[PDB]
């Protein structure tokens, strides 16, 4: 009987007290939306590792449980059972029934150690078996297994120190469930009490993974990029050389004679199995070292060039048996190299080497001319010369016998005392071997990830046939990147290719978690014309970008909504006859709409409309300073002297933060001071019809800002005094803000405040109302406004009458088309971003002071109170260097984005030069169509430009011509073109319907009427 | 290996942070393209009678016999550049991935995305702005699409720098064949872009070193982690692995600022081709 | 204007204005506290059984 | 001339503080090789 677990099983990780934070932990987890069984109304059942128990009951029939290997009195078993009045815990060796139940479990208790006796609706319960230790969580929650979410809190941990792979419960109706454990990373939610109340299972969904990654339980829409698909391996290989025979460990172990030290023995170990175990009833070792392998490792390896060197010392010696020693012996008679790779094993021979009276069989040399080469030998005889006295072999005073004796008698100091010595040196992982270890094979298994170990090298891949054809003297292969590619099979001596088993990345579609809860999978390595997936569906749609899956393919074109890629988009249907789903498209590229050309025709404007647009522009960002010292040492002084070995790495970040902070002013500067006369708005408001008081400073507020600049000014969320008793205590522990400050992260105010700012964007509007563009070219000159538009129309090919004769049409349009943006602003994302970047990067900052770096720990607090001076010099510094590169990081992104800044903010002083002091003739500066004037707005960090454009419209057909002959005569307009309505001939102007008679005032001959094609006729 | 990747956990907020910065750069392409080709959202058809005072469009106009929309011109520059594709596992599993050079780097995590605007879609954005600066002058660059015959607008660019329409009016055949000839030209020389090749070259290149860089020992007694993990337990592996670790993130971190360096110059460009493209293409320029 | 001087390694500091490090201040005094056990562990029933 | 002097003030003293770099420890007990190499075999300097 099945059922489905949802949420529950989720415990406390550790005994800290958390709060108002998200924290992600890696555990023996119950899997999230797993399959329990069902026990209704007592089978035994395995403990794999640890088991998540939980029972519904009403009369305590469940009373408890056992634990163990085998259940009979070969082995040890645990008791943990609650009768009518105690409750029990026993550690023994107990011989158990089929079918206990309560008072008859067991017949007999022989023997054992541990005894916990005294002790005087839903219940669920976790067990583990970790280093020795037997843990348990609990709850117990008043109302077929209900939703909700609880965490279990730890309650005992018991020494047991026993074997345990299967349980079995104690019965006295009721039920309950049983689900295991596996290794997993979830995502837990404190809340302002410090209680779990959320959880999310990473590695459970494709959308859970895109939650564990942003640190949040909602997302937005778009697309996200995931881990690539990722496969497991099915089995494990182990191929090693068939070998039988055993290494001979008695001749050398157990020889009758040992060398002496300055003539050591050598000799070759080849074609058998190195089985040290043998050697656990004969010989003890007081001494056993190993330097470039681990003694753990040893069974599991093969070894390629083996030797083995033997001698006799006497007991104080054998300290210089080793890489880097100096003395008598490592001199003189035996040396290792310093990249040696090998075991050093002695052990104490006074029984077989010490003679009553003395032994003087073992000799070593006492004198040389220089020291000893690696792995060399010296068995000369010759007489050592020491006083630069010659001596042709007699001796005396100056020449001694190199050669010295050994005196080993068994009442000897145990320092002075025979001691005999093997050294064994070999290879591990680079040529053929020959001598293996205690291991097993198994089959070979291609096409397959599967584990493997090949000669002790280990590793995941696919198996496959391979067309090399590697030399007698090669075992494995490599390639650019240094990692093994081809190997030969040991035994069937055949070569084979590795290749990685995980391939191709994975994206994610989501419509928004505020919405839907469903997603869509786009596999971008995959094919389906399926296989390389995490699950097929109903519908699977083929595009040029990958494979996705879960949308339903549509045939229309709309806009792009959330862009997938190579032409194709995909949004939420929600709106449609269907309850909602995904839909995949091709974008559109806007509608087709037509072309009517001809050799003698053109269409004409008869009216136009006046337009405003807006355009936003950053121009600043935040100022920002950092004390290294306390950012990274903290109020350790300890730390605050070791910091002095990088001295110049602090200065040299904050000249680069000090260049940014007063660049800020500048580009603030260039945009806003350019003129440096204040001009003060008229006392009487009279432009020709035209309302401006929409944009004019308003003095009915704090501030002297106009209506649009306070509307802006509230779109956009945030100099600043922060006390030190102002978030002292817990407001430190939820402020963000002082929590930066806390750590040497401040941020400094700007140079002009928006006061002057509005003040400036004042007098710009002021002067160019009043004056026109003279007062950005010099000094200002009255003109009225009537005026200085005809002007502004004559500037864009249109005569002056035109706006002279439409004042008040232009004037009509003018004020609706500005009432319509402060309608529109009603409920600036270029700016906004500006801000979300500049908090985000220091919001990481403060959280990337929780990592290691390596180290044992994060607190140099907790650091301190353990280890001493030399061994937290240490580990200080990892974390100094972790914590430098976090700065050096974060400065650098600093200097990237300011480039940036400031290009934009160029570009923002040359519009407000070219269109705010002047009329500009280039294409699409100062907005769409044709500009006559712009105006300057303030905003926070940036600022707006009103562009006012002229919008030709309601267009006619004419026919037309390129000159006209009189009377042999070629005429030319001379302004304009020349058009005819059906019978009678014009000419007008480009921009506007105006038609007058053809005369010589408005037209020139310079022709003979012969050449010009297209001419007509008429008459002027 | 489980083992690296469960102590690779220390350093958990510096991976989110490269792929924060590369996601950035990735929407930051597709904009640029934007601002650069979608000016007009009205697509224009190529005109039906091709009748423009004796000038010979043909090369540059959209060709309809070729399995795509593009122009002998266009299809002569994209033959020049030698660089969107599914690369499939059973594709380059065996042997193969030894020598393709391009499974080899994502084999190690490394991928290149699709751009979002084909092509096709780009060809046709541009067949739309030839069309309507072909048809309407500069009208259609401003508002609705008013029509005129080819010479009258040839005749206002004459005026445009100052010499009268009747110079025009009285050359137009010789001037039609020097329009011609200088288009022929074109074609001529592009026979047998060096600054566009540079920018594959140099991703090409930045991705390489990254895959190179890999057998890198960064002072531990192995580049493989097979290797070390081989012959020794886990107290005297960790601090081989730690040392891996460091330098691979470093090789990581380095690589992400030269991609964003690289990206404020590509940036640039682009803002100087749009305002080229605005000014040179729908207008006459006096600078 | 030491602190400056020092981190300017310079002897002089042209016009203009530096940023210090922040506002540090010292202990007064050391506190202990730990819980109050009065029995000596059993070292003679472990070491000399 | 200051915004043609700025450029060359800049690039040496760039030049100059990679030459002053050269005298920090970065946790090791000397920041000179010869003395790191004068008194530690090979193993130890490594
Ligand atoms: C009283 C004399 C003091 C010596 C002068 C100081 C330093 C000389 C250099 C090294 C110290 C000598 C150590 C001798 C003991 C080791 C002998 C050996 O087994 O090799
Ligand atoms: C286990 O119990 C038996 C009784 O049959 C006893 O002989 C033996 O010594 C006990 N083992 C231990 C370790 O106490
Ligand atoms: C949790 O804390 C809040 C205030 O932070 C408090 O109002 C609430 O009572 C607390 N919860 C419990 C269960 O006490
Ligand atoms: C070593 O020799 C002794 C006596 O010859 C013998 O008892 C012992 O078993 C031998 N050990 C091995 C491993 O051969
Ligand atoms: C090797 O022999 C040469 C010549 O006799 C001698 O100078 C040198 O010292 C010898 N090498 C060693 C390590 O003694
Ligand atoms: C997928 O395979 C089919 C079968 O050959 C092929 O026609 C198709 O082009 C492939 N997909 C892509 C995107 O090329
Ligand atoms: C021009 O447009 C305005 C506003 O739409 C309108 O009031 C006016 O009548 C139009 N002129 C003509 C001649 O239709
Ligand atoms: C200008 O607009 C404001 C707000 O709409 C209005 O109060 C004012 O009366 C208008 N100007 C005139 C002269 O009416
Ligand atoms: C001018 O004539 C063409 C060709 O018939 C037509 O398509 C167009 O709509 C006409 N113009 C107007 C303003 O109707
Ligand atoms: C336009 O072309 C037609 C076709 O030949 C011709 O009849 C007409 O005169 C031409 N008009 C002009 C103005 O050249
Ligand atoms: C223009 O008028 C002349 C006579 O003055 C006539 O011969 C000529 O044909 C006319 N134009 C056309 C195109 O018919
Ligand atoms: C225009 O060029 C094409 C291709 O070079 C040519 O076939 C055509 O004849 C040219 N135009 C004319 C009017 O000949
Ligand atoms: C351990 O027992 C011996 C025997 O009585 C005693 O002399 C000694 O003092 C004991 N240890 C200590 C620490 O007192």
Same mark, same amino acid.
């Given at each position: 009987a099945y059922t489905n677990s949802f949420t529950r099983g989720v415990y406390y990780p550790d005994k800290v007290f958390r709060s108002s934070v998200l924290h992600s932990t890696q555990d023996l987890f119950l899997p999230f939306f797993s399959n329990v069984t069902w026990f209704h109304a007592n089978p035994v059942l395995p403990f794999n590792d640890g088991v998540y128990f939980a029972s519904t009951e009403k009369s305590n029939i469940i009373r408890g449980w056992i634990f163990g290997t085998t259940l009979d009195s070969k082995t040890q078993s645990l008791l943990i059972v609650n009768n009518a009045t105690n409750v029990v815990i026993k550690v023994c060796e107990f011989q158990f029934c089929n079918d206990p139940f309560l008072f008859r479990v067991y017949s007999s208790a022989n023997n054992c150690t541990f005894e916990y006796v005294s002790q005087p609706n839903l219940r669920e319960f976790v067990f583990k078996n970790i280093d020795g230790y037997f843990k348990i969580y609990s709850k117990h929650t008043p109302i077929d297994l209900p939703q909700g979410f609880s965490a279990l809190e730890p309650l005992v941990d018991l020494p047991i120190g026993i074997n345990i792979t299967r349980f079995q419960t104690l019965l006295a109706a009721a039920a309950y469930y049983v689900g295991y454990l596996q290794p997993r990373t979830f995502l837990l939610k404190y809340n302002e009490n410090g209680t779990i109340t959320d959880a999310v299972d990473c590695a459970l969904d494709p959308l859970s993974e895109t939650k564990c990654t942003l640190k949040s339980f909602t997302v937005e829409k778009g697309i996200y990029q995931t881990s690539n698909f990722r496969v497991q391996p099915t089995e494990s290989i182990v191929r090693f050389p068939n070998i039988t025979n055993l290494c001979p460990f008695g001749e050398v172990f157990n020889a009758t004679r040992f060398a002496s030290v300055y003539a050591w023995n050598r000799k070759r170990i080849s074609n058998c199995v190195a089985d040290y175990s043998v050697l656990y009833n004969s010989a003890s070792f007081s001494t056993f070292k190993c330097y470039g392998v681990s003694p753990t490792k040893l069974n599991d390896l093969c070894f390629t060039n083996v030797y083995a060197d033997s001698f006799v010392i006497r007991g104080d010696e054998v300290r210089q048996i080793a890489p880097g020693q100096t003395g008598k012996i490592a001199d003189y008679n035996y040396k290792l190299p310093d990249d040696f790779t090998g075991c050093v094993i002695a052990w104490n021979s006074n029984n077989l080497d010490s003679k009553v009276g003395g032994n003087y069989n073992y000799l070593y040399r006492l004198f040389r001319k220089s020291n000893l080469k690696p792995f060399e030998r010296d068995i000369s005889t010759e007489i050592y010369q020491a006083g630069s006295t010659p001596c042709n072999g007699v001796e005396g005073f100056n020449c001694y016998f190199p050669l010295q004796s050994y005196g080993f008698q068994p009442t000897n100091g145990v320092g002075y005392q025979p001691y005999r010595v093997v050294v064994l040196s070999f290879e591990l992982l680079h040529a053929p071997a020959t001598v293996c270890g205690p291991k097993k094979s198994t089959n070979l298994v291609k096409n397959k990830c599967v584990n493997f170990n090949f000669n002790g090298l280990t590793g995941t891949g696919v198996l496959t046939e391979s067309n090399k054809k590697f030399l007698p003297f090669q075992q494995f292969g490599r390639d650019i990147a240094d990692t093994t590619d081809a190997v030969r099979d040991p035994q069937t001596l055949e070569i084979l290719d590795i290749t990685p088993c995980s391939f191709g990345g994975v994206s994610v579609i989501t419509p928004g978690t505020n919405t839907s809860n469903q997603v869509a999978v786009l596999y971008?390595? *995959? $094919? @389906? #014309? #399926?296989? &390389? *997936?995490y699950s097929t569906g109903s519908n699977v749609f083929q595009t040029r970008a990958g494979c996705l899956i879960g949308a339903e393919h549509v045939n229309n074109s709309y806009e792009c909504d959330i862009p997938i890629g190579a032409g194709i988009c995909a949004s939420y249907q929600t709106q449609t006859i269907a309850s909602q789903s995904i839909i995949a498209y091709t974008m559109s590229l806007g509608a087709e709409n037509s072309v009517a050309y001809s050799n003698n025709s053109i269409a004409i404007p008869t009216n136009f409309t006046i337009s405003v647009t807006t355009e936003i522009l950053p121009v600043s960002m935040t100022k920002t300073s950092v004390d290294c010292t306390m950012y990274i040492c903290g109020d350790s002084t300890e730390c605050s002297n070791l910091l002095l070995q990088y001295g110049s790495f602090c200065t040299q970040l904050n000249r680069a933060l000090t260049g940014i902070a007063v660049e800020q002013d500048k580009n603030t500067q260039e945009v806003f001071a350019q003129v440096k006369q204040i001009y003060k708005t008229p006392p009487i408001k009279d432009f020709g019809? !035209? $309302?401006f008081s929409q944009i004019l400073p308003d003095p009915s507020k704090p501030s002297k800002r106009s209506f649009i600049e306070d509307l802006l000014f509230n779109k956009v969320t945030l100099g600043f005094i922060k006390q030190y008793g102002d978030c002292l205590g817990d407001i430190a522990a939820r402020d963000l803000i002082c929590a930066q400050k806390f750590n040497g992260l401040t941020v400094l105010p700007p140079l002009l405040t928006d006061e002057m700012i509005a003040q400036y964007t004042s007098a710009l509007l002021a002067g160019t109302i009043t004056s026109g563009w003279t007062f950005g070219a010099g000094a200002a000159l009255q003109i009225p406004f009537a005026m200085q538009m005809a002007y502004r129309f004559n500037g864009i090919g249109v005569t002056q009458n035109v706006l002279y004769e439409n004042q008040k049409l232009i004037a009509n349009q003018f004020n609706s088309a500005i009432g319509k943006i402060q309608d529109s602003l009603s409920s600036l994302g270029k700016l906004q971003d500006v801000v979300n970047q500049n908090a985000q990067a220091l919001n990481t900052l403060v959280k990337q002071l929780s990592s290691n770096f390596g180290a044992i720990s994060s607190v140099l607090n907790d650091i301190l109170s353990r280890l001493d001076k030399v061994e937290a010099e240490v580990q200080i510094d990892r974390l100094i260097t972790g914590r430098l590169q976090s700065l050096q990081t974060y400065v650098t992104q600093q200097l990237i984005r300011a480039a940036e800044i400031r290009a934009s903010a160029n570009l923002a002083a040359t519009k407000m030069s070219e269109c705010v002091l002047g009329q500009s003739k &280039? *294409?699409? !500066? @100062? /907005?769409? /169509?044709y500009h006559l004037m712009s105006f300057p707005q303030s905003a926070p960090h940036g600022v707006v430009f009103l562009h006012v454009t002229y919008v030709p419209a309601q267009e006619k057909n004419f026919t037309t011509a390129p000159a006209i002959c009189h009377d042999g005569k070629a005429h030319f307009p001379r302004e304009g073109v020349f058009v005819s309505n059906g019978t009678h001939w014009f000419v007008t102007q480009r921009n506007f319907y105006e038609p007058q008679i053809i005369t010589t005032d408005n037209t020139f001959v310079s022709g003979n009427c012969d050449v010009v094609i297209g001419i007509v006729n008429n008459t002027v």
């Open positions: 971008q390595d *995959v $094919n @389906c #014309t #399926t296989w &390389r *997936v019809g !035209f $309302n &280039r *294409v699409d !500066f @100062c /907005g769409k /169509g």
